Each structure stands twice: as C-alpha cells, then as structure tokens.
Amino acid sequence: MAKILVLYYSMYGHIETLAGAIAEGARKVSGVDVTIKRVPETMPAEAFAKAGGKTNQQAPVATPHELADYDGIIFGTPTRFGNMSGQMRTFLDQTGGLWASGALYGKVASVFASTGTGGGQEHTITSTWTTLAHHGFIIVPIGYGAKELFDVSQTRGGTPYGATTIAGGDGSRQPSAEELAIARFQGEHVAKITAKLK
Amino acid sequence: MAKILVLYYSMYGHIETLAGAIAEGARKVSGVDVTIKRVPETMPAEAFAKAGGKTNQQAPVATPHELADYDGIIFGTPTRFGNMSGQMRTFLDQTGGLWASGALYGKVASVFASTGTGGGQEHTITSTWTTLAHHGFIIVPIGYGAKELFDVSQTRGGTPYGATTIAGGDGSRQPSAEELAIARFQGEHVAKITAKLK
Amino acid sequence: FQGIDPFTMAKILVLYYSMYGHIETLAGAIAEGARKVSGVDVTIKRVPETMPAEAFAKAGGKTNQQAPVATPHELADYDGIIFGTPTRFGNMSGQMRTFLDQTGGLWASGALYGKVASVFASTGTGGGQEHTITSTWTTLAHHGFIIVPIGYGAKELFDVSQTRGGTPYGATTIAGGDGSRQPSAEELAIARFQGEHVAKITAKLK
Amino acid sequence: FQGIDPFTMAKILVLYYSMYGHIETLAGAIAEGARKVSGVDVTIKRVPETMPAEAFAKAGGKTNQQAPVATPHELADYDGIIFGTPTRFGNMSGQMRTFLDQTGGLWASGALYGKVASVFASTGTGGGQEHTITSTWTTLAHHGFIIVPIGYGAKELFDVSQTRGGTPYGATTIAGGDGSRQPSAEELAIARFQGEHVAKITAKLK
Ligand SMILES: [Cl-]
Ligand SMILES: [Cl-]
Ligand SMILES: [Cl-]
Ligand SMILES: [Cl-]
C-alpha cells in the first residue's frame, strides 16, 4: 500500500480541476491510496475578495508537517511570474523541521502548474524541483510519455516536466481534454514509480 | 540623476548586512540616490518569535506599488530551499497591477542572496530573474568583474549571477570582507548601468 | 577634430545556428527590428556546423544560408549580441555550445563584459523553449553580459487563441515535430519587437 | 526454467567527460559508491573528444583515460546513468552536449523512458556548478528519466569550514582557476554517497 498526496493551491479553479485529473490517474494504480489537499490562503481578506477568490473547494487544508505521512507527493501551483505561488512557497518554507530530520528524503515528487498565457509554465515546475531536491525527493518528469505532447495544432498545455493548463489572461479558458489526459498520465506514471519503490 | 531601491528580506541579519554593502557600492556613482527598504514579515507571531527573528532592522517597510518609483532595484533574499523566501515571493505576487500597466518595464534589476551552506545560492538568484523577466526588467549579473571571485582558498560567497554570503547551518558565520566587496562591486556596477540608461 | 564630437554607431550582431531554417527566419525578423533603431549597425552571422557530414546529410540539413560564418573572437567587435538557437532537449544546440566554449580567451580578458545580450529560440513542440533561453542566459552571465528579456512588451504574447511561440524571455517559433510549421506573422512580430527593444537599450548604453 | 526465477543485475553506467581529470577522479568515486550496492553491475565510460587537435593539445588535454569511449546508442543498455561533466559557463560541456544531441533516435523510440539518472560536475571556481547539474536535468526530463538529487544525505555538505564542492543537486569538485586542486576527501565522500544512493534506487526500480 502506497499513499500519494496531491497537494495544490488554486485561486481561480484551474489548478483544482487539473488536480482532479492528476488524482484520477494515480488511482488507476492498484494498492495506491490518493488524497487531495490544498495549502492555506495567505492573501489578506480584502485583496482576496477584490480579486474574486473562490471559496467552494472541498479539499481539506493540509498542514506542513503531514507531508511525511505520504510516499509520494504531486505538487500543483499556478505561476506567479515564473515561480510557484506565494501560497505554496510560504507553505513549503514551513517544512524546515521535516528537512532537518530527513523526513522527506527519498520520497517521490512531481509537479503540475497553470499560467494565464503559457509564459513561465516550464520555470514554475523546474524551480519547484529545486526545493524538492533540497529535501532529497526523487523527481519525476513526464517526458513525452503523453502522446498529446506531440500535437501542436491547437493551444494546449503540458510540458515534459509535468502537466500544465493555460487559463487565458482573463481566466476564461477551462482545461482542455488533452491537458487533462496529460495530467491523468502524470498521476498514473508517478503512482507506478511510488508503488514500485514502496 | 537616478533612484535605486535596495529591497531585501532578512530574518537573521545576514542579508541586511549584505544590503548595506550593496548600497555603499551604488552610492559611489555620482547622481544616484539609494534607498534601502525591506519587505514585511509574513510569518505568524509565535513561529517568528520561536525562530528567534530579529526586530532591530532600521530600514522602513516597502509597499508593492512603490517599486515603480525607482529606476533600478537590487533585490536581496535568503534562500528557502533554492527559491526566494516566501516573504519576498508574497511581496512580489502583489505587483500584478504594476505588471499590467508595464510600470516596471525596462527598469534595471539585480539580485543578491544568502544561504546556510551555499546550497541553492545560484538558483535563488536566477529563479528571481524569472520574475524580473516577466516584468521586463533589464537583468544585471556581475560575471567575474569582482576579482574576489577567483580566490577559492577559503569558503566565500558570491557568484557571477550576484553577490551571496554563507551563514553556516547555525547562522554563526558573518559576511566576510571578500563577500562584502563583491556586493559593493555589484551595487556600483548596477548603479552605473542605471544612471547610464536614465 | 575641431568642432566635432564623433558620432559612433552602436553595433548589433545577430548570431544564430539553424539546421532547418526556422531560426534563420526568426533571425531575419530580429535584425529587421534592430534596424528600426537609428544609429544602430546590424550584422547577421551564423556559427559553424559541427555534425559529421554523413549524419548532417542524412538529417537533411540546409546548406543555402547566405549568412557568413562567425569566429569566436569577433564577438568582442559588437556592443550587443542577440543569440538564436534551436533547442536540443531543453539546452542550446551543441553547435552553439561548441562555439561559445571557444570564448574562454574573451572571458579571461573580460572582452565581453558589460555588453548587451538577448536570446531567441525554436523547438519542435514547445517543450523546453523557455529553458533553452534561460540556460543560455547562464553562459551570458558568466561573461558579464547585461541580459535583456522582452517581458510582455509585444501584445501578441497575450493572444492564446492559436499555437504561437514567443515568451517573456525572448522570441521563439514552434517548428512542428516534422519541421513543417513556418514562423507565423505573430511570432515574427514578437521577434521584430525583441530586436528593436534590444537595439534601443544597446544604443542608449553606448 | 523449473524452480528458478531469474535474478537480473541492475546496470549502472557512469558516463563522463573530463578534460583535466577532475571529473574522471569524481567518476571513480561515483562508481565506488554504486558498487557497494549488491546486485548492481557498474560500467564507466567517457564521451568522445570534440575539440580540434591543435586546440586540444595547446590546452593541455589529458590522453591517459583508461575508460572506453561510449556510443550514444548503448545508453539504452543500462537501467541507471550517472552523468559527469565539467562546466562550460554554467552549462554542460560541449563534448557532453554533442554526445547527447545524438540521442534523438533513442528519444523517438522512448528507449530511455523511465530509467534513472543523476548528475555530477566540476568547475574551476565554483561558479555555475549548480546550473551545470540542473540544466543537464532538463535534457534528462525530455527523455523521461527519473531524476535523482542527493539532498543533504551526505553530512559533509553541512561543513562550510573550508572551500568544498558538493550540492543537494549532485556531487561536484572545485578545480581552481588553474586546475591545480584535486578532489578533496570530503568531495569524494559526497560522490561515493551519490553513487550508492542512485544505485539503490535503480536496483529497487528494476
Ligand atoms: Cl488557479
Ligand atoms: Cl537572513
Ligand atoms: Cl533550426
Ligand atoms: Cl575536467
């Protein structure tokens, strides 16, 4: 039995939708238990409301210290100027206690992301990899295992580093079927590796 | 005539000390006005106090929209697992309004950092560059203009991407004279470029 | 000279490698943008081929490129250099890497220190286009180049209605897995923007 | 075979380029660590030289490497590959870049998909050692390699009393601007840790 956490932040729902597909893929691996949780909001109340932040997410809020309860963690975040979101950064800064005891060492990790225009989607993933490496995570990219990555006929997210979605500058674009298939592939892929190492 | 902001976060003082050297270098350029400010704390009170956070920093707290009041900005941050600190990330996440109007486009930017063991010092700088590029900053590395970078006889911070210091895992190491000289070089180099573009 | 302040031309080199022509087309747009800046002299050159002849021929490499081949030493003759390369698995091409590996002498004398640099790229499917540029930035930083991204100055970047290259780090084009895609008008406009933007900064810094 | 279930050896390739021997010494330690893991077969090979003869000789290139030269196609013969390269301005060496550019056929067939990879590096002064590793990671990701950093599993990474190589991304050594430094005992311990760590994961995934 392997336990996977799908841990995400989502302000406008795009990452939340992708996380559902990530989790669906992971659950295809027999013997893998998948939990979806989100990191707490950090914006002050007035700014958050002014920005139209959503409060309908059913996923429970995770605590920093519980990450070591899992065998693999798939991290999801919207970009903030080519980095992970401040919400995810602040959450991961609180894992110093886990880092000092080696509590996450040798566990499996993978990353998915979203952007408004595609700009920064690659760097959001690989700069999250940096933090994973300091913890000693085994890092799983997806390469071109997802056949959708070869199709450039239409605006479509997804990179060899991990699944992505493109929300549009105004957030009007919802994740496409191809993007969700890439995320489902990533989830199952990370789950086969996590189960095999357990 | 030109205004430079040295904007930093410092929890244990190492970055604050480096910022003073950064500013000293910038003030060597005639006609350049240099201001030092810090980003607000984001840690909750109990964790911050339990962590031994310092409250003696004289620099005023900056606001996100004031960044456009300057012609060049030199950013300073300790690493959090190879990224900028959550404090700096959260602060810069609030610059979306400046980004939408192009308010920082074409300004000069440079970065310095600190780490406990040296690990992640390079990636802290260049993952901050990613955010600067999304704003359209002109990005200034220092290369090997600082002669101290060739001396590897002893532990010493500083990279071709920007000045750094090494604090030790317990924070007992203070910035060396060589590290501070590299920061002084960086400050003057950035200021010269900023003044020349004005 | 009595009564004269010399007016010196800022010099831009567009330096590229292109196997199937996509980067070559972009470089023309980069150069077109730079030539919009008065007082800027623009040169286009390419790096030498490094593949062995049989592999190159089997891969269908193009040999009709009119641009002269640059030498590593002449990089110091310019005030700004805009580098173009196709990706190789998310890095610059081996051809460009080999060429820049020969600039150790320029590095030791600081010959490129303080010059302006910018980067554009191409990929087959989009994968690695961002990293190709920013991992080229790393080498530029070791030389002390001032690094110029383009941000979202080009309005084309906000239009996600169709497959289109162009990043805040620099212009790109998407060639298709088989290389059958040609640079679109929008991608070329992003490259024209980059050239003019870089040329303006180089001229002002001169 | 009646009553027998085959025990298959996991295979590790330590693949490196070394101009002045620093990476070569590190590769020996990498391999030593891997051979500590039972059930792992360890091979050390190098990538071919790409510099022209006169430049190579003028630069003092070493010709005493006993490691046989690898071909790009044989990478698919292994379960895990630990790559070693000196930096060239914060990237992998052109020699390694040229070698990996020839793996397009393996990439198209997915021949390296799901294998284990890890990276070690060297620099003259420390500058760019982190980016050398993580920009090599990019290429590994395009092939679908599982990427293994070392984190802070090696206790030597906490000792900042002296100039020491090694990062959470992989082992490194610092050669000095003139190349006169040799890998220290601590740096070699980190490399031995990396080899054993990668070998354990490769054996478990097999
Ligand atoms: Cl979102
Ligand atoms: Cl600090
Ligand atoms: Cl091309
Ligand atoms: Cl070497």
**Spatial contact of C30 and C195, defined as CB atoms under 8 Å apart:** yes
**Spatial contact of D116 and D145, defined as CB atoms under 8 Å apart:** yes
Query: Residue C84 corresponds to which tokens in the numbers above?
Result: 């173009």
CA–CA separation, D122 and D156 (whole Å): 17
CB atoms within 10 A of CB A97: 11
**Spatial contact of A175 and A165, defined as CB atoms under 8 Å apart:** yes
Residues in chain B, overall count: 198
Could you give the C-alpha distances from D65 to B159, C58, D48, in angstroms and in order?
A: 32, 32, 11
CB atoms within 10 A of CB A148: 18
**Spatial contact of D91 and D85, defined as CB atoms under 8 Å apart:** no
Is residue D184 classed exposed, middle or buried when 0-12, 13-18 and 19+ CB atoms within 10 A define those classes? middle
The residues, any chain, with a CB within 8 Å of residue D63's CB and separated by 6 or more, are none
Q: What is the DSSP letter of B69?
A: G
Which residues of B are less than 8 Å from C168 in CB distance?
133-134, 136
CA angle D89, D95, D100 (to 5 degrees): 105
**Resolution in A, one decimal?**
2.0
**Spatial contact of B158 and B166, defined as CB atoms under 8 Å apart:** no
| B105 three-state secondary structure | coil
Instruction: Establish if B119 touches chain A: CB-CB under 8 angstroms.
Output: yes
Q: How remote is the CA of residue D112 from the centroid of ligand 3, in Å?
A: 24
CA–CA separation, C81 and C194 (whole Å): 12
Q: How remote is the CA of residue C61 from the centroid of ligand 3, in Å?
A: 9
φ/ψ of B61, rounded to 5, equals -80, 130
CA–CA separation, A149 and C123 (whole Å): 13
Is residue A123 classed exposed, middle or buried when 0-12, 13-18 and 19+ CB atoms within 10 A define those classes? buried
φ/ψ of C81, rounded to 5, equals -130, 125
Q: Do D94 and C92 touch (CB under 8 A)?
A: no
CA angle C80, C83, C88 (to 5 degrees): 165
Q: Do B105 and C153 touch (CB under 8 A)?
A: yes
Report which residue type is found at D3.
Answer: G
Could you give the C-alpha distances from D147 to D137, D198, D204, in angstroms and in order?
A: 7, 10, 15
C-proximal residues of A, 153-172, CB under 8 Å: 153-156, 159-160, 166, 168-169
φ/ψ of A36, rounded to 5, equals -110, 125
- Give DSSP secondary structure letters for A16-68: HHHHHHHHHHHTTSTTEEEEEEEPPP-S-HHHHHHTT------SPBP-GGGGG
Measured in whole angstroms, how far is the alpha carbon of residue A21 from the centre of its chain? 11
Query: Residue C80 corresponds to which tokens in the numbers above?
Result: 């700004």
CA–CA separation, C22 and C182 (whole Å): 7
Neighbours of ion ligand 3 (CB under 5 A): C 18-20, 22-23, 86
CA–CA separation, C24 and C1 (whole Å): 42
φ/ψ of B72, rounded to 5, equals -140, 150
Instruction: Establish if C126 touches chain A: CB-CB under 8 angstroms.
Output: yes
**Spatial contact of A163 and A182, defined as CB atoms under 8 Å apart:** yes
Where do the H-state alpha helices sit in chain C? Answer: 22-34, 53-58, 94-101, 104-109, 129-142, 185-205
φ/ψ of A132, rounded to 5, equals -60, -40
- Give DSSP secondary structure letters for B113-154: EEESSSTTHHHHHHHHHHHHHHTTPEE---TT-SGGGG--SS
Among the partner residues D55, D94, D128, nearest to C138 by beta-carbon distance: D128
Alpha-carbon dihedral sign for residues D174, D180, D182, D186: negative
**Spatial contact of D30 and D202, defined as CB atoms under 8 Å apart:** no
Closest CA to A15 of A62, A75, A78, A74: A78
CA–CA separation, D76 and D69 (whole Å): 15
**Spatial contact of B167 and B157, defined as CB atoms under 8 Å apart:** no
CB atoms within 10 A of CB A50: 10
| CA-derived radius of gyration, chain A | 16
Closest CA to A68 of A7, A143, A145, A154: A7
**Spatial contact of D89 and C138, defined as CB atoms under 8 Å apart:** yes
Closest CA to B93 of A53, A45, A86, A115: A86
Q: How remote is the CA of residue D78 from the centroid of ligand 2, in Å?
A: 44
In the block, which residue shows the tokens 């330690």? D29
The residues, any chain, with a CB within 8 Å of residue C189's CB and separated by 6 or more, are C29, C154, C156
The residues, any chain, with a CB within 8 Å of residue B158's CB and separated by 6 or more, are B146, B148, B149, B164, B178, B179, B182, B183
CA–CA separation, B156 and B139 (whole Å): 24
Ligand nearest to the CA of C18: 3
Query: Residue A100 corresponds to which tokens in the numbers above?
Result: 């000092």
The residues, any chain, with a CB within 8 Å of residue A95's CB and separated by 6 or more, are A64, A65, A67, A104, A135
CA–CA separation, A43 and A52 (whole Å): 12
CA–CA separation, D93 and D84 (whole Å): 10
- Give DSSP secondary structure letters for A116-172: SSSTTHHHHHHHHHHHHHHTTPEE---TT-SGGGG--SS----BTTB-EEE--TTS-
Neighbours of ion ligand 4 (CB under 5 A): D 18-20, 22-23, 86
CA–CA separation, B154 and C170 (whole Å): 38
| A95 three-state secondary structure | coil
CA–CA separation, C181 and C125 (whole Å): 10
Query: Residue C81 corresponds to which tokens in the numbers above?
Result: 């250099």
Could you give the C-alpha distances from A90 to A16, A101, A113, B46, B91, in angstroms and in order?
A: 19, 20, 17, 16, 11
Where do the H-state alpha helices sit in chain B? Answer: 14-26, 45-50, 86-93, 96-100, 121-134, 177-197
| CA-derived radius of gyration, chain C | 17
Instruction: Establish if C146 touches chain B: CB-CB under 8 angstroms.
Output: yes
Measured distance between the N- and C-terminal CA atoms of chain A, rounded to whole angstroms: 8
Which residues of B are less than 8 Å from D163 in CB distance?
152-156
In the block, which residue shows the tokens 């050390």? D44
C137 in a labelled binding site:
no
